[PDB]
Write a protein that binds this ligand. Structure first.
Ligand SMILES: *[C@@H](CO)[C@@H](O)[C@H](O)[C@H](O)[C@H](O)COP(=O)(O)O
Ligand SMILES: *[C@@H](CO)[C@@H](O)[C@H](O)[C@H](O)[C@H](O)COP(=O)(O)O
Ligand SMILES: *[C@@H](CO)[C@@H](O)[C@H](O)[C@H](O)[C@H](O)COP(=O)(O)O
Ligand SMILES: *[C@@H](CO)[C@@H](O)[C@H](O)[C@H](O)[C@H](O)COP(=O)(O)O
Ligand SMILES: *[C@@H](CO)[C@@H](O)[C@H](O)[C@H](O)[C@H](O)COP(=O)(O)O
Ligand SMILES: *[C@@H](CO)[C@@H](O)[C@H](O)[C@H](O)[C@H](O)COP(=O)(O)O
Ligand SMILES: *[C@@H](CO)[C@@H](O)[C@H](O)[C@H](O)[C@H](O)COP(=O)(O)O
Ligand SMILES: *[C@@H](CO)[C@@H](O)[C@H](O)[C@H](O)[C@H](O)COP(=O)(O)O
Lengths: 223, 223, 223, 223, 223, 223, 223, 223
């Protein structure tokens, strides 16, 4: 399972990349507009992320119409080979995906909330589909159930579109995505940070340290 | 999973095709006779649909006897290479399918209401079999259970006949079909139009628009 | 399981009532506005339904504010002992339900789309809660799963609020509701009339009639 | 589980009753017409069955309209206290059941093919409901599944209507009915006979006889 | 669960009774005729067993006809109040059980090999029914499945006939019977003797003995 | 799944073969003796069946000893390449199968009633094994369970012997065989006929005809 | 599934072999010592079995120490290419297995009572592992559950050691072994002879014989 | 499944290695510090284990920082080609594993307590991952459940990292690990010695010994 960071915060991205556990990044218009403040321009932020991240970086078109989406998608693609164009699940978006796929431009279909929307995005040729699990949780439906159905559907038809689980809110969305077999999860920085941690890891390290001091006062291993 | 449009309404078909989410069309004598009124000839409607739709178009014979079925099937076939001949599940129909298969004319067995009828159609060599789910729901039996059994049976015997789920009434028929792994669903236009939609997609788009205006008052993405 | 008719059409109601299979009626502002045309007044329609139907008749408030909802509710109550006041799942709506419940005015919480909304309506003291199954089906979620969870939750806490399944679209919503154990379904007229029918019933009657004529020419049963 | 005999053959009835394994009888117009041959009159057949059988005896009305059904039902009821009036699952039928129930006349609703038909009959106050399992098997649906759902539904609502499984064709219909918990099965004579039998019973008897001869040449137990 | 000994061997019975784990005895013509050799009379064996065993003792009739069965049953009954009359699952046997039940003579229906035979025996009023599990195992059917179905059926109808599992061949028949909830098992002596035993019991006792010698060389507990 | 006809009635065979739905025929000595009446000779009946039927035709030996079975088998095989020799599950039978398999003569082991009998037949090299499901139903055991276990066993060991389900009594035996994945079912003619039929097929045909009349009074499809 | 005979009785072996259903033989020191009486020598018994049986013949070492076990093993090996050396699950036994496996001497690890013992024997390279099911049943644990776990473990790791189920007591140990997919069962003679038998086989043959005599007086099948 | 010894005690290791059932060894700072007392040096202990164990020997770094971990790892590697470097699940540990993997130095990530930690370790390229089951049991969660999830996740993504189950406390941890399909278990010496043993193995050997003495007074097997 690939793990992407879901943020436009450059400090977060630099930190996660330096950890070597980040395989790519997703952004969206809300995340970008959050960071583009106090003199920061959205063009600069987008370019900076593309440069810092080796892996896929998803950037969302803002046009709602086919022609505008395709024009923006081409500009996004032009910014770097790792750029992936994020396109919403709408009639115009499916049309844009089909055109862009034929032009060999990688795509990510977003704002997906049920398995049939996901199947339609796959049929348009999309590179990644992003169902939102937290926003479903918000409205009282267990969002992970949709991921499970999408995985079964895609398995049934040998679909090559990757499942990129989005709107992740906690480490159990991550755990359940891996057990289901989603291709990618994209996670906010707080969640990413949590993933490596467990109290028994800390406790075990402390005990090893203490026991080793018994035989090596300076705590060294000399071989 | 292929998605066909189940109508003879030329306006619906043009619209669906332009959406890019329609892989073929199914008709039947009721659908066609509904459209062929106030001057419109059934022969013209059939030809127009064949012209408009790139993918398979199912057209049903009206003869109840073997010889008449085959004679009608050949005429249907001659109207275009994308024509598929719809034949009912009857003794004469099974005979006609067998003959037509040997002539390399694609066939679609219809009015199937249990898994054994579907198996018989596959044994006759039919290209598609169309179990009806809504008409079973109508009489108090969950039609989707028949689809589930047909998929299992076809899997068991590595049967190449495609399952083309028909009498679809709602988007859950479509969802359950995809999870089962049916090859094709054919849907009325009202159902088709609902498949792309979800209130959280609309809501997320509105929020993205609003947030983006904060960094680009005119609402565009200049890269 | 009680069976209510979901309509404001007097002809449908008179017909279903005379069939003996209708235990009550649910209306809403859309259904009533459909009928209040060609000079028919909504006030007359409502009173007429109350008169024809011996069982519960739900009638929806139109105000969105607490004070207006309880004013309208008391007026609805004043129309007949069988009136039930339909109130939407909103903050004001729950406050209204709590007040009316204490006043011993029967209530029906509507526009419920998940089990926790249903629980909140029950906690406010509502007489009936109406989850909408068809409108969930519309958006690609199997609405019956919400009925199943609500039944489990209500069982857990011995909740006395009745589950009144609404937005019913077909006879399998009705079947599944009965197997789950919902207290009430409310169904459109087209669904109601289908519930008694089965082709093997018709076939079986025809055969019995024919056999009997073999021993009683006139077809009589003289005892 | 009560076991009824499904026949109008007087000889079978006498034999079954004398085996002591028969709790009642069901007839229908086909079964009776079969016996009312060569001078035998249907009215005499019906009266003799009521006489020979201590348990319930189902006799079906032939009229298809409400007034005729109620008139014939009252006549059937007048023939003896053990008479039960068989009424078909129709609009008129349900009305007749309601009326007759209020007159304390026992009823059996017949020609039921799904669980919602059975529920409607129960709601009309019917004494017994008779779903047909063999005729469902005939059309490629496992009829025992309908009995299972009806049992669950009736359990949910504490329904007092008895499930009387009909159209029984083999001993596994009987076994499955008992495991589900149906109130009554009605069986043809040939099925009835087979229920007492097993090759290991016969084999064990033969062996006990042979072994006992060794200790008692005359094969008696003298105590 | 009661545990009966399935033998006519008086030595086995005395031994089992002295162990305190035998609640009753079952015999049959094969078991008795096995013991009644070289002078020993079957009448004496039966009387001795009735004297030795406090609990129920099943003794089988040898007549195959109703009148002979009942005459033998009454003689068996007169030998002692703890006698239970074993009657085979046949038409004549069901008749005899019914008569004997009305006379307050306890009965045990034997040679039962499926759940419907067991139900018929319960319907005749039998005190115990004895399905055979080993003889089913002999012919390639898992006999315990029949016990499981009988328990479910008897539970469904609140049947008071006790399930007395017979033809027991090993301790897992006994374990599975207890987990299912059979009322009684009847076991051959070899199986009986194994039930108390386990290698870890012996091993734990040996260790306890050894450890105790360390604080009390003579091996006693002085308190 | 292949469908064979289980009959020696020449008229049924001709009819079934001409429906095009029959892949072979099974006979046995009872079926043949039924036809060999009024001058008709068994040898002529067998030869005619081999002639009319292109697929396998099972003909049963009557000898009970190894030498007689092998002699009769060779004669049956000599009558035509499509002849398959039916051999009973006995000690001599298994030996005959082994010999005949080494002689490249196709075999069908019959009178199988449990899964281990079926495995032994497969180990002897038999071409088809025929468990009897109806005769198990007769004695109160669901015969389809044996087919399920045999399928699992044969899958485990990659056994090439084909499962040919026999003693079929109804269309649910057929449905369950297909869902399990049995290689072949052999069915009586009356069952065969019922497999193509469904009341909703007939009803849908009638409706298509009526609707088409509106657009074509003569009910033809002129293209 | 292979079927071996678990005995040292030459008469039983000759008989089972001549039946054609015995694929090999297992012995042990108890079985051999039973037979080596009245002047019969164990050395002659073993060589005689090796001669009669074409398949694997397991013969158990009596030494408890590594050196003795490999010495005896090599001598057993020297008796015939079909000899298999049975070695118990002990520390010395595993060492012996590892040595012999490298010497290409076939081995059978015996006295296995749980799945981890079976895994250790496999890891030592053993040809066959023999878990004991009956001796577990003796102590109140269902021994077949251990076979199921061993099959799962061996599947997980693609282990080539064959599972050779031993301490078989009845035909359901054999049935369950086949459904689980054990490679081999070894069975006592009394169990072997029961595997071919079923009362409905005998009953069916008798009926076929009678019917045939109706058309062939002599009972011949002349073709 | 590979079985390693989890200890730094040379006597235990020498013993297990002599038994032939130990495939490798794991150590940790606590285990080593335990043995390195009363003059024993940790350097000698580590080298000694490397010398006598043919298979993988895991040795843990003590540094908590990336540079120290990588340096200590290279030193461990240099001690022998069977050394595996144990590295804790921390940020600097994952970085170290990635570097060491690129240097073709085998690694074992330790102190793993949930499946997502295990996944991150795999993503870093670790050779083995070691989730701790006993320490989870300690804090009241069944640690084997984490092993099951890790197996499923690794299967989903065809991950080549081996699951090395650690903190093993009893033989049921070993059994469950094998049933799940873990690649390796590492076990304390007390657990290891218990794996070969079972009381029925001992009892069976004693009986075989006793019986053989009947045929061979000196207890030998002469062939
Ligand atoms: C792109 C893939 O769709 C990604 O940035 C998504 O847009 C975000 O994961 C969601 O919008 C986050 O929503 P949430 O409601 O904050 O969890
Ligand atoms: C052809 C079969 O592939 C297709 O047009 C079917 O005839 C229709 O789907 C059904 O007739 C539609 O029936 P419904 O009762 O309207 O749902
Ligand atoms: C009242 C709730 O008991 C009832 O009238 C509901 O308002 C209706 O059942 C729904 O509004 C019907 O919606 P649909 O989308 O037409 O199925
Ligand atoms: C009455 C219902 O209690 C009963 O006589 C039923 O009418 C019969 O069981 C069925 O008509 C029998 O039909 P089948 O198709 O012969 O099985
Ligand atoms: C009486 C029934 O309660 C009892 O003695 C039974 O007759 C026996 O348990 C069986 O006959 C024993 O048969 P098996 O074939 O020896 O196991
Ligand atoms: C042969 C097996 O392939 C086949 O003819 C069988 O003999 C028959 O199916 C059975 O004998 C039919 O028995 P039933 O009891 O009539 O169902
Ligand atoms: C060898 C293992 O393949 C085999 O002879 C076994 O030793 C026997 O199957 C058992 O010893 C038989 O024990 P039981 O307790 O008589 O069933
Ligand atoms: C190393 C593999 O990670 C191995 O030595 C582990 O460190 C041990 O298995 C555990 O530390 C043992 O802990 P426990 O709490 O004693 O069971």
């Amino acid at each position: 399972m690939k793990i992407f960071l879901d943020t436009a915060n450059i400090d977060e991205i630099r930190t996660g990349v330096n950890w070597g556990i980040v395989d790519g990044v997703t952004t969206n218009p809300t995340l970008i507009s959050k960071e583009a403040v106090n003199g920061k321009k959205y063009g600069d932020i987008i370019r900076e992320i593309l440069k810092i991240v080796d892996g896929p970086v998803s950037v969302e078109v803002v046009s709602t119409k086919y022609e505008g989406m395709v024009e923006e998608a081409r500009k996004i693609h032009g910014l770097g080979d790792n750029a992936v164009v994020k396109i919403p699940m709408t009639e115009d978006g499916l049309r844009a995906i089909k055109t862009l796929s034929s032009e060999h431009i990688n795509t990510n279909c977003t704002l997906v909330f049920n398995p049939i929307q996901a199947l339609l995005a796959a049929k348009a040729g999309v590179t990644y589909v992003s169902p939102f699990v937290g926003r479903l949780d918000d409205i009282g439906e267990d969002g992970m159930q949709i991921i499970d159905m999408i995985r079964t559907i895609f398995n049934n038809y040998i679909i090559k579109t990757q499942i990129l689980v989005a709107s992740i809110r906690n480490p159990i969305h991550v755990l359940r995505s891996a057990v289901i077999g989603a291709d990618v999860v994209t996670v906010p920085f707080n969640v990413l940070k949590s993933l490596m941690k467990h109290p028994k890891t800390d406790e075990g390290l402390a005990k090893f340290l203490e026991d080793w001091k018994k035989v090596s006062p300076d705590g060294k291993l000399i071989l």
